[PDB]
Amino acid sequence: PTHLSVDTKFKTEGLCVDIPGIPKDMTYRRLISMMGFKMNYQVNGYPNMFITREEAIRHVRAWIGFDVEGCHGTNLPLQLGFSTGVNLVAVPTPLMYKGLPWNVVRIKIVQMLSDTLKNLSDRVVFVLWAHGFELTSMKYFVKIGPERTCCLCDRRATCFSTASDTYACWHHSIGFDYVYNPFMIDVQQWGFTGNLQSNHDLYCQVHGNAHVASCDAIMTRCLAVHECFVKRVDWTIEYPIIGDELKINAACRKVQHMVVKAALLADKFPVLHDIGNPKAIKCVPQADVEWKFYDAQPCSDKAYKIEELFYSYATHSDKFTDGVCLFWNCNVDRYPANSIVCRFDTRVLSNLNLPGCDGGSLYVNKHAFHTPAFDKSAFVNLKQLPFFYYSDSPCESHGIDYVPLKSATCITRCNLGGAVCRHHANEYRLYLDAYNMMISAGFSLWVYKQFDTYNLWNTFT
Ligand SMILES: COc1cccc(C(=O)Nc2ccccc2F)c1
Ligand SMILES: [Zn+2]
Ligand SMILES: [Zn+2]
Ligand SMILES: [Zn+2]
């Protein structure tokens, strides 16, 4: 059971208003045939247009919500809506486009999907809340067949051109008119009571219903993300490398060690309360400090209430006011004043961050992590942590060209003494690169208000 069997049953109740008289007993095989697609028995890597929930989750980067509202089906114009916010009107003669025939509409579909997905995925997964018109309109912009490779590269083919009789991936499809071998999943098959709006609105107040096809397409993908990443969490699903994942993760580790090592040196806290990942290790293993861990998995729904993290039932809680609290990606509602905090900004635009549910986002780097909406009020007791580099390693080169470094934020013995050595200048530039990478990925750093880098200079006495 790797793929979805075409002989699986498809509940057709959601399809009977657009398709009155639809048989109650229906397989994917018959539905695909009814949609105009002839599979001709093909063992070539594309066994079904429809996929399982498990396969949809593994391909979350490919998700595109799709809804079709029948404005007036071959007689009446259809409004095509995508979770990109695009609305295309197709005539058979929140970006709203005027009524145009299918031959030109299909060119716009290929362009939009290619520009949206070329850096995210090797495919498209149309996420539906199927009522009928969306499935029967697919034949107007979709071609299917054996799995293929791009005419210009080795990537999987996602588009086909009737003008050149050629196939292309999302990167080489300019001017192509057909979506080739797409995937699709119907959320309505998962067993919901009531319509799309009522189920979506139970978990999200950010997507309204301005009564356009894109509003439903956005709500559909959002409800799917809630089901697969908010109420259900699977951190064992490994995701491919599509960008700066490795550099970002390495930068996070370097920044964490730097900031924690410096706060401990500057304010000599006797104890550190490490609140977050149950699998975390000491980021500063040489520090004197009493290191105490508290397990709290990444919250995918709402940010943790600081009160419930301290909630100890019939026993006493550990004192948090003693020493410093470290919250490295531990999303809470309001941090204590004695904290070192790394909070992901869900609003960041990137290929790793996908739109999520109720203001939150789905950060996909090796694993998928739905993160609750970034809330500036969480940090009222803290200040933004300024960039600085700290080093107490000996001034020794060991060796890339060089230009003299002049920086007030290079906290080293050599800078104190009047001139940064080449080694600390190379390490400062590498650290600043890592720092910028982590900030640009969407992470924000916060610290207790008494934090002052001036206190680091006296560690060179
Ligand atoms: C010092 O900072 C923290 C941070 C987070 C949690 C605790 C704590 O003591 N929690 C606790 C204790 C006994 C039973 C259940 C619990 F959740 C202390
Ligand atoms: Zn290509
Ligand atoms: Zn939503
Ligand atoms: Zn130096």
Swiss-Prot record:
Stretches assigned to the ExoN domain: 49-230
Catalytic activity: a 5'-end (5'-triphosphoguanosine)-ribonucleoside in mRNA + S-adenosyl-L-methionine = a 5'-end (N(7)-methyl 5'-triphosphoguanosine)-ribonucleoside in mRNA + S-adenosyl-L-homocysteine
N7-MTase domain location: 239-461
Catalytic machinery residues: D67, E69, E134, H211, D216
Quaternary structure note: Interacts (via N-terminus) with DDX1. Interacts with nsp10.
Primary role: Plays a role in viral RNA synthesis through two distinct activities. The N7-guanine methyltransferase activity plays a role in the formation of the cap structure GpppA-RNA. The proofreading exoribonuclease reduces the sensitivity of the virus to RNA mutagens during replication. This activity acts on both ssRNA and dsRNA in a 3'-5' direction.
Name of this chain's protein: Guanine-N7 methyltransferase nsp14
Protein species of origin: Severe acute respiratory syndrome coronavirus 2
Residues of the full protein shown: 5949 to 6449 of 7096
